């Protein structure tokens, strides 16, 4: 509707739906929409023609070639040659009409939000410009390479503080209780559904992002696409939220793990977010980390080789965390920074091999060999105060290097087992008071007002500590920030607890009980999840924390250890006694330390005499009878 320009504009649209032929890919009524879409930011902020370019912009976020792009804008241009395409560039009387943006944007106004350490290049600004144009008309979806940083250019947008950038990270069964919320009762009542963090965002601004929704828990996308048929309504039981604008943004990956719907990938204006370009990344590491002309140029050179040699790792992430990491001040130590932290995840010595010629192409305890290559790692990773996983065999030598490095590095390495309430008391906890405080009462009345007794407490009422007395809340991750946690078996973690895990992760603690954020004074999260419910977390989560992948006559000399005074050689044929048994039974060079544990234990526990029947009798009764 809203002259002949306009119809010449016709012609114009015409065009580019008529060069629609010039190969889904850009299909029918995607023109409808942006039709729509330059309806909508017509007189807010746009020419016609600036409004077709905004238009033709989402007609070509996820394309292959820009010579659409040329000829759209030539299209459109011409409508409205080089100084004309920078009178495109005019923001001045877009901005003058909402907290405005930089340049063709001006987007709404919300906590009051400022910059961040979030410096960007050439193409980061033109994607950001992109999102930034889907950012005002209000679904939209993101997908691509995860390293890539589409939540840290959501975030960097959300810095104009259209929102905060409240990234639900559904992870593999993120169930309802992640999504709609609910909580822990009261000091007396119920309280059965009594949060949230989608709905949070429904009823205030904080604009949600229900990320990694690829491989999403298969209901919770259809109640979700149910929530994605009113605007912002939703029904829990109670019924709608109706929100102002913050955003709706989404991010899947790059597209065989559990292909999203195509119907959902046709209900939502959607993006593709591709991969940063090469010097994009050697210029933006530059300043986020300390620069060096070519030990920092030669990294990301590294980063394209990995990528040149091809659900392992390649995360940038990690590649911040090498550089950040490496404090080296020489070429030759910065490469070993760098092959280490790739060195890390190595599920084989093929592709490890093959990195680290890409690489060159740039105490009461038992000392061990092959478990030195875990302990030094460890500790490196220790004065780096990285996030920190462990993982690999069910027994390999994990807790044994926890308790190493709390020996050696003199500490309280409070530990945990996972797989309800405990994994929140990893962070927090709520239960009923050790009524020593009903006794300090009594001294709470005696540094109280009106005093000269619960009827004083009722003397008192009638003109907090009153309503904790009414009334009958700290964490292990809470006692470790105020005084390492090792919260051993993460895979079977909760999922909340590892939400408020990924807020305590990335550079910064938190304590989210009204909250507050906790310091760390070395509150290490040095976990561990053996490999293989062993459903692993989200990519992030996984990336978001230095892992480590881990496995002789050393192991007879560990069972020397393990044995009794002098009882000895028994353990030195059970050692070969197991290697026979494990080649011959379940045939694997493993030592499979359960057993020979448990043997070394009835071993020493040997109340009878004629050390080779009590061997003939232990190996009778862990490994033989067994078969
Ligand atoms: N421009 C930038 N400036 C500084 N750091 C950046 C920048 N871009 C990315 N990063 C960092 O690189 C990582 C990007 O990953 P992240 O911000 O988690 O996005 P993401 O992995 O897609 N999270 P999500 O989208 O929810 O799955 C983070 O550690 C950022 O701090
Ligand atoms: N060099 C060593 N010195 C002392 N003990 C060792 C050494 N190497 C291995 N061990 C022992 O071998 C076992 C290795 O298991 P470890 O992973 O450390 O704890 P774990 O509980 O068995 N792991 P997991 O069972 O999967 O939770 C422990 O009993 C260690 O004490």
């Given at each position: 509707?809203?002259?002949?320009?306009?119809?010449?504009?016709?012609?114009?649209?015409?065009?580019?739906?008529?060069?629609?032929?010039?190969?889904?890919?850009?299909?029918?009524?995607?023109?409808?929409?942006?039709?729509?879409?330059?309806?909508?930011?017509?007189?807010?902020?746009?020419?016609?023609?600036?409004?077709?370019?905004?238009?033709?912009?989402?007609?070509?976020?996820?394309?292959?070639?820009?010579?659409?792009?040329?000829?759209?804008?030539?299209?459109?241009?011409?409508?409205?040659?080089?100084?004309?395409?920078?009178?495109?560039?005019?923001?001045?009387?877009?901005?003058?009409?909402?907290?405005?943006?930089?340049?063709?944007?001006?987007?709404?106004?919300?906590?009051?939000?400022?910059?961040?350490?979030?410096?960007?290049?050439?193409?980061?600004?033109?994607?950001?410009?992109?999102?930034?144009?889907?950012?005002?008309?209000?679904?939209?979806?993101?997908?691509?390479?995860?390293?890539?940083?589409?939540?840290?250019?959501?975030?960097?947008?959300?810095?104009?503080?259209?929102?905060?950038?409240?990234?639900?990270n559904?992870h593999e069964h993120?169930?309802?209780?992640?999504?709609?919320?609910?909580?822990?009762?009261?000091?007396?009542?119920?309280?059965?559904?009594?949060?949230?963090?989608?709905?949070?965002?429904?009823?205030?601004?904080?604009?949600?992002?229900?990320?990694?929704?690829?491989?999403?828990?298969?209901?919770?996308?259809?109640?979700?696409?149910?929530?994605?048929?009113?605007?912002?309504?939703?029904?829990?039981?109670?019924?709608?939220?109706?929100?102002?604008?913050?955003?709706?943004?989404?991010?899947?990956?790059?597209?065989?793990?559990?292909?999203?719907?195509?119907?959902?990938?046709?209900?939502?204006?959607?993006?593709?977010?591709?991969?940063?370009?090469?010097?994009?990344?050697?210029?933006?590491?530059?300043?986020?980390?300390?620069?060096?002309?070519?030990?920092?140029?030669?990294?990301?050179?590294?980063?394209?080789?990995?990528?040149?040699?091809?659900?392992?790792?390649?995360?940038?992430?990690?590649?911040?965390?090498?550089?950040?990491?490496?404090?080296?001040?020489?070429?030759?130590?910065?490469?070993?920074?760098?092959?280490?932290?790739?060195?890390?995840?190595?599920?084989?010595?093929?592709?490890?091999?093959?990195?680290?010629?890409?690489?060159?192409?740039?105490?009461?305890?038992?000392?061990?060999?092959?478990?030195?290559?875990?302990?030094?790692?460890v500790?490196?990773?220790?004065?780096?105060?990285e996030p920190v996983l462990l993982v690999g065999?069910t027994?390999?030598?994990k807790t044994?290097?926890c308790?190493?490095?709390?020996?050696?590095?003199?500490?309280?390495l409070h530990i945990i087992n996972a797989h309800?309430?405990n994994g929140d008391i990893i962070g927090?906890?709520?239960?009923?008071?050790?009524?020593?405080?009903?006794?300090?009462?009594?001294?709470?009345?005696?540094?109280?007002?009106?005093?000269?007794?619960?009827?004083?407490?009722?003397?008192?009422?009638?003109?907090?500590?009153?309503?904790?007395?009414?009334?009958?809340?700290?964490?292990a991750l809470?006692?470790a920030?105020?005084?390492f946690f090792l919260l051993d078996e993460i895979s079977l973690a909760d999922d909340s607890v590892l939400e408020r895990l990924n807020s305590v992760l990335?550079?910064?603690?938190?304590?989210?009980?009204?909250?507050?954020?906790?310091?760390?004074?070395?509150?290490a999260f040095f976990a561990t999840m053996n490999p293989g419910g062993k459903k692993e977390l989200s990519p992030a989560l996984r990336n978001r924390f230095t892992e480590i992948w881990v496995?002789?006559?050393?192991?007879?000399?560990?069972?020397?250890?393990?044995?009794?005074?002098?009882?000895?050689?028994?353990?030195?044929?059970?050692?070969?006694?197991?290697?026979?048994?494990?080649?011959?039974?379940?045939?694997?060079?493993?030592?499979?330390?359960?057993?020979?544990?448990?043997?070394?234990?009835?071993?020493?526990?040997?109340?009878?005499?004629?050390?080779?029947?009590?061997?003939?009798?232990?190996?009778?009764?862990?490994?033989?009878?067994?078969?």
């Open positions: 509707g809203s002259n002949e320009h306009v119809i010449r504009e016709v012609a114009e649209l015409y065009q580019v739906a008529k060069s629609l032929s010039l190969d889904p890919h850009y299909t029918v009524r995607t023109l409808s929409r942006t039709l729509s879409y330059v309806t909508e930011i017509a007189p807010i902020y746009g020419l016609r023609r600036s409004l077709y370019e905004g238009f033709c912009m989402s007609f070509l976020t996820l394309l292959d070639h820009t010579s659409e792009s040329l000829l759209y804008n030539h299209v459109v241009r011409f409508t409205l040659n080089r100084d004309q395409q920078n009178a495109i560039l005019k923001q001045i009387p877009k901005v003058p009409d909402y907290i405005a943006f930089c340049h063709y944007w001006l987007r709404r106004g919300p906590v009051e939000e400022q910059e961040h350490y979030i410096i960007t290049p050439f193409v980061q600004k033109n994607l950001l410009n992109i999102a930034r144009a889907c950012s005002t008309r209000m679904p939209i979806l993101i997908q691509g390479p995860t390293s890539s940083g589409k939540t840290s250019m959501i975030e960097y947008v959300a810095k104009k503080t259209g929102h905060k950038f409240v990234r639900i559904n993120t169930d309802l209780q992640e999504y709609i919320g609910t909580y822990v009762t009261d000091d007396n009542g119920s309280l059965s559904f009594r949060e949230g963090v989608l709905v949070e965002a429904l009823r205030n601004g904080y604009w949600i992002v229900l990320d990694e929704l690829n491989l999403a828990p298969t209901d919770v996308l259809e109640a979700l696409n149910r929530l994605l048929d009113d605007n912002r309504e939703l029904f829990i039981p109670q019924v709608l939220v109706k929100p102002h604008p913050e955003f709706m943004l989404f991010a899947t990956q790059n597209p065989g793990r559990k292909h999203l719907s195509r119907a959902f990938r046709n209900r939502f204006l959607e993006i593709h977010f591709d991969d940063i370009p090469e010097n994009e990344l050697e210029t933006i590491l530059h300043k986020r980390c300390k620069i060096a002309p070519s030990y920092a140029a030669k990294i990301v050179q590294v980063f394209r080789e990995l990528s040149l040699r091809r659900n392992s790792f390649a995360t940038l992430r990690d590649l911040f965390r090498w550089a950040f990491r490496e404090a080296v001040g020489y070429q030759q130590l910065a490469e070993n920074g760098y092959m280490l932290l790739a060195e890390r995840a190595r599920d084989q010595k093929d592709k490890l091999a093959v990195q680290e010629v890409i690489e060159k192409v740039m105490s009461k305890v038992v000392w061990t060999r092959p478990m030195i290559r875990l302990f030094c790692l500790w490196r990773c220790l004065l780096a105060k065999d027994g390999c030598g044994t290097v308790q190493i490095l709390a020996e050696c590095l003199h500490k309280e309800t309430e927090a906890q709520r239960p009923v008071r050790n009524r020593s405080a009903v006794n300090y009462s009594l001294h709470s009345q005696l540094c109280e007002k009106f005093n000269v007794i619960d009827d004083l407490i009722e003397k008192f009422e009638k003109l907090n500590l009153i309503e904790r007395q009414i009334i009958k809340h700290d964490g809470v006692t920030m105020k005084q990335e550079l910064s603690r938190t304590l989210t009980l009204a909250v507050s954020l906790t310091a760390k004074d070395g509150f496995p002789t006559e050393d192991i007879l000399k560990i069972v020397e250890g393990k044995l009794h005074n002098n009882k000895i050689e028994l353990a030195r044929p059970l050692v070969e006694y197991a290697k026979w048994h494990a080649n011959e039974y379940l045939y694997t060079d493993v030592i499979s330390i359960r057993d020979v544990l448990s043997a070394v234990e009835f071993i020493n526990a040997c109340e009878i005499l004629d050390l080779n029947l009590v061997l003939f009798n232990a190996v009778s009764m862990v490994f033989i009878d067994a078969l």
